[PDB]
A paper describes a structure:
Proteins from the bacterial small multidrug resistance (SMR) family are proton-coupled exporters of diverse antiseptics and antimicrobials, including polyaromatic cations and quaternary ammonium compounds. Representatives of the ‘Gdx’ (guanidinium export) subtype export a bacterial metabolite, guanidinium ion (Gdm+), in exchange for two protons. Representatives of the ‘Qac’ (quaternary ammonium compound) subtype are proton-coupled exchangers of quaternary ammoniums and other hydrophobic, cationic compounds. The overall fold and many of the binding site sidechains are shared between [name] and Gdx-Clo, yet the two proteins have markedly different substrate selectivity profiles.
Previous structures of Gdx-Clo were solved at pH ≥7.5 in complex with substituted guanidinyl compounds. In order to compare the substrate-binding sites of Gdx-Clo and EmrE3 in equivalent states, we solved a new structure of Gdx-Clo at pH 5.0, which is close to the value for the present low pH EmrE3 structure, pH 5.2. Both transporters are likely proton-bound at this pH, minimizing differences in sidechain positioning that might stem from interactions with bound substrate. A comparison of the low-pH EmrE3 and Gdx-Clo structures reveals conspicuous differences in the hydrogen bond network within the binding cavity, despite the conservation of many key residues. In Gdx-Clo, Ser42 participates in the stack of alternating hydrogen bond donors and acceptors (W16Clo/E13Clo/S42Clo/W62Clo) that fixes the position of the central Glu, E13. In Gdx-Clo, E13Clo, S42Clo, Y59Clo, and W62Clo are constrained in a highly organized H-bond network. We likewise find that Gdx-Clo does not tolerate perturbation to its hydrogen bond stack. Although neither S42AClo nor W62FClo directly bind Gdm+, both mutations eliminate Gdm+ currents in SSM electrophysiology assays. In Gdx-Clo, the substrate-binding glutamate sidechains are constrained by a polarized stack of hydrogen bond donors and acceptors that also includes W16Clo, S42Clo, and W62Clo. This hydrogen bonded network would be disrupted by the rotamerization of either E13Clo or W62Clo.
Residue numbers in the entry:
A (entry chain G), D (entry chain F): 4 to 92
B (entry chain B), C (entry chain A): 1 to 104
C-alpha cells in the first residue's frame, strides 16, 4: 500500500535524488527507512531514516558507474511490502 | 475556570486516547501526531488546573471525563452496546463530577 | 502475577499525580521529572499487566487505585478537604469510573 | 530566590559564558529563560530559554566593546527574583 512509486528524480555520478508517494493522510507513516547498497553486496548496505512528512530523499557518496538497489521501508511490515528499485549511477 | 481547564484536559485526554489506537504501533503520522499534541495539552492543562485545585479532585474529575468521553465516543461512533449498567455508571460519574464542582 | 504489576502501576499513577501537584505546573524540576517518569512507568507496567489480565478489570483496578490514592494523599500531604459531601461525591465518581472501565 | 550568583564564567569580544546557582534540589526549576541586550537601549533584548538542569549558558553573537545587561528568569517569580548583571565585551 505505502510507499509507492519510488523513482530517481535526479542523478549524478555520485548521488541520487529519490522520491515516493507518501499516500493519503491516513496512510502517512511517521518515518520511512531508506536503504541503498551496491546491487550485489560487497560487504554491508547503507541505511538512514526520513520523517514521514517527507517524500523525497537524497543519497550521496555513491560509486559512479555502479548499479545500486534502493529500498524504502515503512515503519512496520503492516503498511506494505518494501518497494525498491535498481539504478546505475 | 480551573474546572473549565480540567474539562478541556479530559477532552484532550480522550482525544489522544483514541487517536493512539488509530495510529497502529505509533507509526501513522497524523494519528501519532494528534496523540502527541493531545497528550501535551491534556497534561499541561491538567497541571495548570492542579495549581489551584486539590490533586485528588482534579485527577479524579480528569479521569472521569476521560472515561465518559471514551464511552460516549464508543456508543456514538464505534458502535458500542448501551446497557442499563453503563447508563447508571455514566449517571454516577456525572453526579460525582457535578457535586464535586458544587462543593467548591 | 500480573495482578501485582497492575497494583504497582496504580501506585505509580498516584505517584505521578502527587508529583504533578508539587511541580506547580511543570515548573519545579524533580516533581516534573518524577511526574514524567512515573507516567512512563505506570503506562509500561499497565501494558505488562494488561497483556495478561482483562483490560476491563485491569483498567478498573488501575484507575481505581490511581484515583483513590490520589484522593487519599491529597487529603494527607496537601491537607485537602475531607468533608462528608466531598467524600460521598468522590465515592460516586470513583464508582462510576470503576464501573465504566469494568464494562468495556 | 532562584537563581543566585549570575557571573560571566568566560568571555570573548563576541560571546559570554555565564553561570548561576540553581539552588537546592527543591528550588530547581524545569527551565530558565535568559535575556540579554545592549545596556544603552536602542533595540529590544534578545532572549532564549535553557533547561533547568543547566546552571550555565552561553551568549553568542554580540558586539565587541559594548555593554550588555543579562537577566536570568525562573518560570515564575513565586520564589523567583530575576537576577541581572552588566558585562562589557
Ligand atoms: C509531558 C508533560 C506535559 C507537557 C509539559 C508542559 C510544560 C509547560 C511548562 C509550563 C510553563 C509555566 P508558565 C506560567 C510561564 O506558562
Ligand atoms: C523534565 C525536565 C527536562 C527539561 C525540559 C525543558 C525543555 P525547554 C523549555 C529548555 O525547551
Amino acid at each position: 500500500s505505502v510507499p509507492t512509486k519510488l523513482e530517481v528524480v535526479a542523478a549524478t555520478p555520485t548521488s541520487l535524488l529519490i522520491s515516493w508517494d507518501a499516500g493519503h493522510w491516513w496512510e502517512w507513516v511517521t518515518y520511512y527507512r531508506i536503504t541503498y547498497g551496491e546491487t550485489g553486496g560487497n560487504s554491508p548496505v547503507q541505511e538512514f531514516t526520513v520523517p514521514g512528512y517527507s517524500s523525497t530523499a537524497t543519497i550521496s557518496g555513491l560509486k559512479p558507474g555502479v548499479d545500486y538497489t534502493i529500498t524504502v521501508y515503512a515503519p512496520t511490515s503492516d503498511y506494505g511490502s518494501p518497494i525498491s528499485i535498481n539504478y546505475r549511477t | 475556570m480551573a474546572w473549565l481547564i480540567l474539562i478541556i484536559a479530559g477532552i484532550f485526554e480522550v482525544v489522544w486516547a483514541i487517536a493512539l489506537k488509530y495510529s497502529n504501533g505509533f507509526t501513522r503520522l497524523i494519528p501519532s501526531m494528534i496523540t502527541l499534541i493531545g497528550m501535551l495539552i491534556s497534561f499541561y492543562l491538567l497541571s495548570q488546573a492542579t495549581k489551584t485545585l486539590p490533586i485528588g479532585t482534579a485527577y479524579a474529575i480528569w479521569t472521569g471525563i476521560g472515561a465518559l468521553g471514551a464511552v460516549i465516543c464508543g456508543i456514538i461512533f464505534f458502535k458500542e452496546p448501551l446497557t442499563a449498567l453503563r447508563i447508571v455508571f455514566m449517571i454516577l460519574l456525572l453526579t460525582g463530577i457535578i457535586g464535586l464542582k458544587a462543593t467548591s
